[PDB]
């Protein structure tokens, strides 16, 4: 009956609350790998810097 959940009068952040931040870094990692694929092909056609 008591709705008084005692423990959460403030608290530290939790990895699972911060997950949405790491998603941006992960998307950056994925997109930089993908972009790197395009130069990794095209430099084979340039044969030069």
């Amino acid at each position: 009956y008591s709705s008084v959940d005692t423990k959460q009068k403030g608290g530290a952040l939790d990895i699972k609350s911060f997950a949405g931040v790491f998603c941006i870094l992960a998307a950056g990692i994925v997109l930089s790998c993908f972009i790197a694929m395009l130069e990794t092909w095209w430099n084979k056609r340039k044969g030069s810097r």
Partner: protein
């Protein structure tokens, strides 16, 4: 106040066994006619185990 003590979230409380205080809170807690949340929540904490 006893309202705070029965609604606080930090400290366990109790009394001496078989005391007229323990029995008074029992009379306010186990009685079918008395139904105050304050006294009944005092009792449950006093009634545990």
């Amino acid at each position: 106040s006893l309202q705070d003590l029965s609604k606080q979230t930090e400290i366990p409380y109790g009394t001496v066994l078989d005391s007229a205080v323990y029995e008074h809170v029992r009379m306010k807690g186990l009685n079918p006619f008395e139904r105050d949340s304050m006294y009944s929540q005092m009792w449950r904490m006093i009634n545990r185990s």
